[PDB]
Coordinates of C-alpha atoms in Angstrom, one line a residue:
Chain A
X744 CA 29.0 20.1 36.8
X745 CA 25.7 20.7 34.3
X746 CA 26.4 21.3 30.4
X747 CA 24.1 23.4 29.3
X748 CA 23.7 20.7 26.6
X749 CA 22.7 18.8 30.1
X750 CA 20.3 21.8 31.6
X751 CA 17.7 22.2 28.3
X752 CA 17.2 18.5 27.2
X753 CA 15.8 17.2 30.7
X754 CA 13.4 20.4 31.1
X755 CA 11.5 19.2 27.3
X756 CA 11.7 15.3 28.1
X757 CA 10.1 15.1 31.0
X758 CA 7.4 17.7 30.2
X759 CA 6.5 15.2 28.0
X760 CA 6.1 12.8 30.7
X761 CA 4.1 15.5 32.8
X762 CA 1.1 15.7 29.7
X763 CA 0.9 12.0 29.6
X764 CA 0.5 11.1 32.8
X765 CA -2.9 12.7 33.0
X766 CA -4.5 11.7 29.6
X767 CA -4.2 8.3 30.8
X768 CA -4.4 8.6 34.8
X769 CA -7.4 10.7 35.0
X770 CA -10.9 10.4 34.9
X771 CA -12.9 12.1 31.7
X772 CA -15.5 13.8 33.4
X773 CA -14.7 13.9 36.9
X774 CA -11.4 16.0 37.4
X775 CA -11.2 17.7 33.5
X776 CA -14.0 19.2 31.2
X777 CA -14.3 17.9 27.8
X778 CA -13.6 21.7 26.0
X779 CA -11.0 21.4 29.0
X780 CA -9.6 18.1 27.2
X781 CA -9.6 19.5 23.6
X782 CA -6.8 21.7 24.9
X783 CA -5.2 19.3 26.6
X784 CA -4.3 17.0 24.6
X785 CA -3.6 19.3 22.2
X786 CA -0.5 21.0 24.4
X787 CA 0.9 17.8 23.9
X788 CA 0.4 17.8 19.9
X789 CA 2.5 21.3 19.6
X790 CA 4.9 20.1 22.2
X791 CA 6.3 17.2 20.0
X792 CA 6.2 19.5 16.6
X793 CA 9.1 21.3 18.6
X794 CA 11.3 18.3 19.5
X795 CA 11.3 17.1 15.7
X796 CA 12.2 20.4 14.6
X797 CA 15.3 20.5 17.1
X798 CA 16.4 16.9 15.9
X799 CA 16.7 17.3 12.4
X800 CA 16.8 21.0 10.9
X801 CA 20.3 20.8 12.4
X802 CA 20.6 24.3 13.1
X803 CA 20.5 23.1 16.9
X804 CA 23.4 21.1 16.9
X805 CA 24.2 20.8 20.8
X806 CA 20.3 19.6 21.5
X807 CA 20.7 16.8 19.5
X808 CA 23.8 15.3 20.8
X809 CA 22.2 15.7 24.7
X810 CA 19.2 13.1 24.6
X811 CA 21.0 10.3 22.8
X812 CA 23.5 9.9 25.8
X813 CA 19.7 10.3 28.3
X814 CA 17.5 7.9 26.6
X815 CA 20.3 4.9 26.6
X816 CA 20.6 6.3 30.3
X817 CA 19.0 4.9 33.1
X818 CA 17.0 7.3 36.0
X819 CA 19.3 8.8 38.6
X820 CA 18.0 6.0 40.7
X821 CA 14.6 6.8 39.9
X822 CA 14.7 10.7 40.6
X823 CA 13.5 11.2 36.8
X824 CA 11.4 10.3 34.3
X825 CA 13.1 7.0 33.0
X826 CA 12.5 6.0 29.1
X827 CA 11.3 2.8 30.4
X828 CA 8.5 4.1 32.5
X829 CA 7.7 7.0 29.9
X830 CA 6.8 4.4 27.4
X831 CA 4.1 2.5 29.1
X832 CA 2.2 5.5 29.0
X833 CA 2.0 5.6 25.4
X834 CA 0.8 2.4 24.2
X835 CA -2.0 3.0 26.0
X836 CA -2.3 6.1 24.4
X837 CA -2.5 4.0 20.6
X838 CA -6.3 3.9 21.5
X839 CA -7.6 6.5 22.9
X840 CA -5.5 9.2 20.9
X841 CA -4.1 7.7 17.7
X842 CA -2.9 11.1 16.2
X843 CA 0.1 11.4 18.9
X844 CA 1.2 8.2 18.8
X845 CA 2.3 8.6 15.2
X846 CA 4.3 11.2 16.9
X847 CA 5.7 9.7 19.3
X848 CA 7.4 6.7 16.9
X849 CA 9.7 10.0 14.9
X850 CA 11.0 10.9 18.2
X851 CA 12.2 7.4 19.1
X852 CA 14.2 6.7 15.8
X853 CA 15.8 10.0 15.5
X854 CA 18.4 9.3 18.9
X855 CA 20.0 6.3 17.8
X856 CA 17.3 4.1 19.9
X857 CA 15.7 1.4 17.6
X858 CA 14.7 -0.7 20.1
X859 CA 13.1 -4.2 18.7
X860 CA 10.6 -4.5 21.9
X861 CA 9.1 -1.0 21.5
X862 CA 8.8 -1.4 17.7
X863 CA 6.6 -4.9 17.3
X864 CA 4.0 -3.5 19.6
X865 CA 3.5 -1.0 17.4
X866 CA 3.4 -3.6 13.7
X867 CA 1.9 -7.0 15.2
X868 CA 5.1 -8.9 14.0
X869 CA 4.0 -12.4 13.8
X870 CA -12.8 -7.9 13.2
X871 CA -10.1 -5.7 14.0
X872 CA -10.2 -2.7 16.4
X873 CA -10.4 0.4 14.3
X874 CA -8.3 3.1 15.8
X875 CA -4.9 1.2 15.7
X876 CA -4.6 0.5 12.1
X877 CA -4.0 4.3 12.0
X878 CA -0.7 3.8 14.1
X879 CA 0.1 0.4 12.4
X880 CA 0.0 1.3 9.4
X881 CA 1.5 4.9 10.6
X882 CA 4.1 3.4 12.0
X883 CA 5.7 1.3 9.2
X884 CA 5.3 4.0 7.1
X885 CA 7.8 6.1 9.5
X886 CA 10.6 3.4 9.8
X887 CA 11.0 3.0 6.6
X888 CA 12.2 6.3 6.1
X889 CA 14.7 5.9 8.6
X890 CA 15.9 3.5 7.2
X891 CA 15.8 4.8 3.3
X892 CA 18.2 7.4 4.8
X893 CA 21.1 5.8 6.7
X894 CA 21.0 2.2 4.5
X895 CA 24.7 1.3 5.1
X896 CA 23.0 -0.2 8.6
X897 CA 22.0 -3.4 6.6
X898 CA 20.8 -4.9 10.4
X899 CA 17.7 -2.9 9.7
X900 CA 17.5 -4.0 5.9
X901 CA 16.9 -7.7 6.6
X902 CA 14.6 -7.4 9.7
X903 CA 11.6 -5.6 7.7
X904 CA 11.5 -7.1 4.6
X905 CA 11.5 -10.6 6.2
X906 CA 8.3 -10.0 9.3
X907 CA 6.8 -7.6 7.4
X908 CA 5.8 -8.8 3.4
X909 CA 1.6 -7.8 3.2
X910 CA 2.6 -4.9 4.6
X911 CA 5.9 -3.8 3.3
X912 CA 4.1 -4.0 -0.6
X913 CA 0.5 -2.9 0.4
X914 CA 1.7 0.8 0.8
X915 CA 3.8 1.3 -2.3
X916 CA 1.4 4.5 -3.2
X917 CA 3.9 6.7 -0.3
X918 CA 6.4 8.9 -0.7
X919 CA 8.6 7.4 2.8
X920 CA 7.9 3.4 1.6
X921 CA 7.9 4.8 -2.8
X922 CA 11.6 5.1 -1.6
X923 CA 12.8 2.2 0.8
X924 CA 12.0 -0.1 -2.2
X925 CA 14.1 1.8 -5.0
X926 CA 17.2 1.5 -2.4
X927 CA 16.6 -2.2 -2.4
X928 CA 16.8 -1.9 -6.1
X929 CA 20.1 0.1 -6.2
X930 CA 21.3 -2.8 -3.5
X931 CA 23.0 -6.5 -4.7
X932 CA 22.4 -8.6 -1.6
X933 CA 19.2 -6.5 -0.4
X934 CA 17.4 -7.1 -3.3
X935 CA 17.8 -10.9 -3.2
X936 CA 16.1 -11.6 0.1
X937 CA 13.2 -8.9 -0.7
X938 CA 12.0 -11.7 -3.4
X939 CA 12.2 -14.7 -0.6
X940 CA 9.6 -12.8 1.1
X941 CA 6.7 -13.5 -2.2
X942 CA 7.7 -17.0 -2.4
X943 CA 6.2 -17.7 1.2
X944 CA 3.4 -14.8 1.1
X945 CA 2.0 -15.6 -2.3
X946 CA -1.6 -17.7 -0.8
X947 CA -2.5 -13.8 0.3
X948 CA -1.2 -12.0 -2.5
X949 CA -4.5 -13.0 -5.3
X950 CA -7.0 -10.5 -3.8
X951 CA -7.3 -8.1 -7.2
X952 CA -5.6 -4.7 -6.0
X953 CA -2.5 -6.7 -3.9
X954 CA -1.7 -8.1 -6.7
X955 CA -1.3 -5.0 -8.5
X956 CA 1.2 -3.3 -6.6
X957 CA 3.5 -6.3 -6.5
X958 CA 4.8 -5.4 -10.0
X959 CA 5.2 -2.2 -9.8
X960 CA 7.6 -3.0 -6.7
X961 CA 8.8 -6.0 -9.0
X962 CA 9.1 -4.0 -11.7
X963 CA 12.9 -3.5 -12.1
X964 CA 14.8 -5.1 -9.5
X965 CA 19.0 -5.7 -9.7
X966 CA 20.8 -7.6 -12.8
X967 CA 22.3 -10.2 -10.9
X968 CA 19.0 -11.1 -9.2
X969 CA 17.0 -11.1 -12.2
X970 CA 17.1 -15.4 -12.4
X971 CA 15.2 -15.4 -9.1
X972 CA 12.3 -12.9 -10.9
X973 CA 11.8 -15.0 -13.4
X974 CA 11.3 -18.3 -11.3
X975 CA 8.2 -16.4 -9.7
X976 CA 7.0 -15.0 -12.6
X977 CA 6.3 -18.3 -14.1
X978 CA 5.6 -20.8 -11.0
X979 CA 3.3 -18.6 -9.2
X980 CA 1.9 -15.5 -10.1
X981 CA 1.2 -16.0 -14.1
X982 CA -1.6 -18.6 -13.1
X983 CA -3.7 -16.0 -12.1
X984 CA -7.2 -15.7 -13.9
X985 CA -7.5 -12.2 -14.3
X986 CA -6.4 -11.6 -18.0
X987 CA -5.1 -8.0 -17.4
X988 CA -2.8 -9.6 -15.0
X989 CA -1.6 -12.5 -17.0
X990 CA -1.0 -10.1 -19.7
X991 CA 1.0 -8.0 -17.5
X992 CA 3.4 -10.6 -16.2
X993 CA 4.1 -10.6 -20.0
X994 CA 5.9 -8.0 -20.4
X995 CA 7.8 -8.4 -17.0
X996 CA 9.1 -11.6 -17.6
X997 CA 9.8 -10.6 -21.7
X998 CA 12.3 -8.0 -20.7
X999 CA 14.4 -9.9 -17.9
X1000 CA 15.6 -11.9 -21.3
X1001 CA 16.5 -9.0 -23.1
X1002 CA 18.8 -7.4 -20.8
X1003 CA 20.8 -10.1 -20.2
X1004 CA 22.6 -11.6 -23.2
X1005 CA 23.6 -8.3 -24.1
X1006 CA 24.9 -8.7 -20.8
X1007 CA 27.9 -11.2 -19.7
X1008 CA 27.1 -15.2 -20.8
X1009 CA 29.5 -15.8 -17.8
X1010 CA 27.4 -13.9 -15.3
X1011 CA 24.4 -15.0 -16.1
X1012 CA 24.8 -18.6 -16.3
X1013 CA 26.0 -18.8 -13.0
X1014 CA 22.5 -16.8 -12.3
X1015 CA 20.1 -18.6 -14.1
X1016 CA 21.4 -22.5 -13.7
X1017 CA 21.3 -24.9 -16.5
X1018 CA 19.4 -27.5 -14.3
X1019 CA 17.2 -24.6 -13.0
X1020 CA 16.5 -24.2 -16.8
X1021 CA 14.7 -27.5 -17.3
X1022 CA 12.5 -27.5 -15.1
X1023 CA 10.3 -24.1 -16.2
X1024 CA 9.7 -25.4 -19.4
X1025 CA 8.6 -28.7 -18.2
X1026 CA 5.3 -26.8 -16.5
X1027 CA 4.3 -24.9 -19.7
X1028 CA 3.7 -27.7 -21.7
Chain B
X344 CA -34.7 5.2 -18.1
X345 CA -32.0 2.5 -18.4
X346 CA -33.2 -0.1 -16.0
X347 CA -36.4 0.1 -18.3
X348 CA -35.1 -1.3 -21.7
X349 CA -33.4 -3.9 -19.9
X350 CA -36.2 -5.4 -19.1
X351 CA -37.7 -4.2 -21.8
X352 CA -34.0 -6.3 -23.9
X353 CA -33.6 -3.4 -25.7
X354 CA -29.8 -4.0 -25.1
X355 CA -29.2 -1.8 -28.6
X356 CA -31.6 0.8 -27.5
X357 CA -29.6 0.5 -24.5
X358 CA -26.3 1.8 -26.1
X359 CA -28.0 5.2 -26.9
X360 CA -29.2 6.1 -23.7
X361 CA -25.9 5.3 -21.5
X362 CA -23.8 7.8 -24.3
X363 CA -26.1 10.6 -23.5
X364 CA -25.4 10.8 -19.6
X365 CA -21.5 10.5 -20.3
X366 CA -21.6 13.5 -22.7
X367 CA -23.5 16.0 -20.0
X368 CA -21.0 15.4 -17.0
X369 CA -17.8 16.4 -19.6
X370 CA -19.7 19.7 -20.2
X371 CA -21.1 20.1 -16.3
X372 CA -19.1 18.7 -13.7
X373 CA -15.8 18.5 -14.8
X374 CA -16.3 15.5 -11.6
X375 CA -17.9 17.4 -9.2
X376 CA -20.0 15.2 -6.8
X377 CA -23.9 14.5 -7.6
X378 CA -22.3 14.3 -11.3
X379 CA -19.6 12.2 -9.8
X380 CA -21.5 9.4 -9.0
X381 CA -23.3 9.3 -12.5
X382 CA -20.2 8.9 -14.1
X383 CA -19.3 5.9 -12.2
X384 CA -22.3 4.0 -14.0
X385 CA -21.9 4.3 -17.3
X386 CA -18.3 3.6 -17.6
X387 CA -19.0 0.0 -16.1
X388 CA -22.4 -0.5 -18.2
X389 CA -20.8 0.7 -21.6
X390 CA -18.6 -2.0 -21.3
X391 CA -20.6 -4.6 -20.0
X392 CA -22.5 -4.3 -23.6
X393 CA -19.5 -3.8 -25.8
X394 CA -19.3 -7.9 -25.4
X395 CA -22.5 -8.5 -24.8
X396 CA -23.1 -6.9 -28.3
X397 CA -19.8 -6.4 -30.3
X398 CA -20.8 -3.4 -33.1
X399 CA -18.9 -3.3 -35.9
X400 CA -16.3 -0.5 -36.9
X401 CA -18.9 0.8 -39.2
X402 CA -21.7 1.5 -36.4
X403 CA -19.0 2.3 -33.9
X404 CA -18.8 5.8 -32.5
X405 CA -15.8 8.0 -32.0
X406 CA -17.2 7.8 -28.2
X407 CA -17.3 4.1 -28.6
X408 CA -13.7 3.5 -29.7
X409 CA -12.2 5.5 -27.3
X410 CA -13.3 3.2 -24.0
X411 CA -12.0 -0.1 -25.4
X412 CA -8.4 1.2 -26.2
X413 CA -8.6 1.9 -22.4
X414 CA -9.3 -1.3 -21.2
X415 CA -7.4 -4.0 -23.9
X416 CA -14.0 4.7 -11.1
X417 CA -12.5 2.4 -8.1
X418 CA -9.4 1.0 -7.9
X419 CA -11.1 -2.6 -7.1
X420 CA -13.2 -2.5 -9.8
X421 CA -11.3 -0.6 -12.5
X422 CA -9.1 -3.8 -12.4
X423 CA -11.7 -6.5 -13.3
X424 CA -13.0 -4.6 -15.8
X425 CA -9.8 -4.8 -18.0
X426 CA -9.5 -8.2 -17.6
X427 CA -13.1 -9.1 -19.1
X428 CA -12.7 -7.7 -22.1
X429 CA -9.5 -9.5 -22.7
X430 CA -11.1 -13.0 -22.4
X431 CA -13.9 -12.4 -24.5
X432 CA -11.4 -11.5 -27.0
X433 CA -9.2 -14.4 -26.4
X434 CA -12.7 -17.0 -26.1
X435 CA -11.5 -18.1 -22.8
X436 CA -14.1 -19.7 -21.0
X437 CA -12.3 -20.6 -17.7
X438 CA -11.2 -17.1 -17.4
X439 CA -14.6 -15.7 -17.7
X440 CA -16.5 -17.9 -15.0
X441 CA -14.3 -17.4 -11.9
X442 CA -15.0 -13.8 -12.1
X443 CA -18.7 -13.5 -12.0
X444 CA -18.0 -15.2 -8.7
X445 CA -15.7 -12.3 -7.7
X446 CA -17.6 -9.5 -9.5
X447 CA -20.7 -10.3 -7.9
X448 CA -20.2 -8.2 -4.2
X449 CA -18.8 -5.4 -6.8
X450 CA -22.0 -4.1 -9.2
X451 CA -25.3 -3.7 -7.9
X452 CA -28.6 -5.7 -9.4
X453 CA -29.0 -3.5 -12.6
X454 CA -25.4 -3.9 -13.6
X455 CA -25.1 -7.4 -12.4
X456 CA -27.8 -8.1 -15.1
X457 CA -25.9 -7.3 -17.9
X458 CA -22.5 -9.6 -17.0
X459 CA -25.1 -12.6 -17.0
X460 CA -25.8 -12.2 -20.3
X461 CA -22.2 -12.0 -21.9
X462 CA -21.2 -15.1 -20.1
X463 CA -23.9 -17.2 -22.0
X464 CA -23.2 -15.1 -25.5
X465 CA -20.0 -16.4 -25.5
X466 CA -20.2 -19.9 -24.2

């Protein structure tokens, strides 16, 4: 007994498995032309336009529902293209073709299939070849904005923020990563562990333009996590010789003061300690 | 006709002909491309000067004021540039030598002769 949910979501997953076991399984100039492979690989580049379309205009409600029950699924015993197999053809696509492999990482996230093993291939969680940095960088760009949208998942919060910290800042000129960080800000607890993340990364963030996108993503951060801001604004990154960036950690650290004893004295004391106190005016003298 | 005076150490001479390439590009390329790339050099020379030798407010242009409210074109360089102004300004010799050291890959030969001779002006 088919659905016919069940009838039109294997026909368009496993035509993607039909355009992909060529571009990597056959030979360049034996079997295929070259003006042959522009068009080739470029029925696979309108093909995956048309899943994304399906997946979130949500006009197609019934199509949607379908592949998240398929992708969690095994093979009928191997009589199908199995999301285990159909993924080992596509990280060795990340070289040769590094357009559709940005492509390929929407798809994944939009079923419910955030899958860690898939996703640190992709980002190198702890010269350079030059075609990858396309999808690595490409790819980080595209989960955050999954998880800007659906932030009540706070499993997905605390995994990027922590591997990912020269990254996560270095891109702040996006529109999908411009608004994972102002989330954070809106968050209590999420903010607090984005700041851990400096503390440990600071020996790579001197270079003259990383530096300079650290406080605009340090700009305004949460009220009741403004004590830890002003522990790094003092111990690490004021130290720095370049005057237009000791002068601009002055007016960062001026206005964390300000805001807060027209706030609550009981709040804040229990933020900023009185034995953390003594110590930061110890290293300016 | 700038990389002439310089050896020549006309460094005042120097101010005049760096104004007149500035005021051509604001009336023809805006920048286009070949006037692009003209534009980048005398924003980083002007300034370079400015500190070498600090006019006063009397012989201090209208073109001339408006650059150092700026400061006090890439995105690697645009940031070093507001920081040396700052020092010179504030007579901070340890801020001034650890960025000849990291402004040295940045400028070619003709500007990297005019940050040699601020450094030594001011210490």
């Amino acid at each position: 007994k088919n659905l016919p949910e069940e009838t039109f979501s294997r026909f368009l997953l496993q035509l993607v498995g039909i355009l992909l076991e060529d571009i990597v399984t056959k030979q360049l100039k034996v079997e295929m032309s070259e003006q042959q492979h522009t068009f080739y690989c470029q029925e696979l580049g309108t093909l995956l336009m048309c899943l994304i379309h399906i997946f979130k205009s949500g006009m197609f409600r019934r199509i949607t529902a379908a592949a998240t029950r398929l992708f969690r699924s095994d093979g009928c015993g191997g009589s199908f293209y199995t999301l285990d197999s159909l993924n080992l053809r596509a990280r060795s696509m990340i070289t040769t073709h590094p357009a559709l492999v940005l492509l390929w990482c929407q798809i994944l996230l939009l079923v419910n299939h955030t899958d860690y093993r898939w996703w640190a291939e992709v980002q190198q969680t702890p010269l350079g070849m030059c075609n990858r940095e396309i999808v690595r960088r490409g790819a980080l760009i595209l989960f955050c904005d999954y998880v800007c949208q659906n932030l009540h998942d706070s499993e997905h919060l605390t995994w990027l923020i922590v591997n990912h910290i020269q990254d996560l800042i270095s891109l702040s000129h996006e529109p999908p990563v411009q608004d994972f960080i102002s989330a954070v800000h809106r968050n209590s607890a999420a903010s607090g562990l984005f700041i851990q993340a400096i503390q440990s990364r600071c020996e790579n963030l001197s270079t003259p333009t990383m530096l300079k996108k650290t406080l605009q993503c340090l700009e305004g951060i949460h009220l009741s996590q403004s004590g830890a801001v002003l522990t790094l604004y003092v111990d690490r990154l004021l130290c720095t010789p370049f005057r237009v960036l000791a002068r601009m950690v002055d007016i960062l650290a001026c206005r964390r003061v300000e805001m807060l004893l027209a706030a609550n004295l009981q709040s804040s004391m229990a933020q900023l300690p009185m034995e953390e106190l003594n110590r930061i005016q110890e290293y300016l003298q | 006709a700038a990389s002439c005076q310089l050896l020549a150490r006309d460094y005042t001479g120097a101010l005049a002909v760096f104004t007149r390439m500035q005021r051509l590009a604001r009336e023809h390329g805006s920048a286009l491309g070949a006037f692009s790339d003209v534009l980048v050099r005398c924003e980083v020379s002007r300034v370079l000067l400015l500190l070498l030798l600090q006019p006063p407010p009397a012989k201090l242009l209208p073109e001339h004021a408006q650059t150092l409210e700026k400061y006090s074109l890439p995105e690697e360089l645009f940031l070093l540039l507001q920081s040396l102004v700052m020092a010179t300004h504030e007579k901070d010799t340890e801020a001034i030598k650890s960025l000849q050291v990291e402004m040295w890959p940045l400028l070619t030969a003709e500007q990297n002769h005019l940050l040699h001779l601020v450094l030594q002006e001011t210490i």
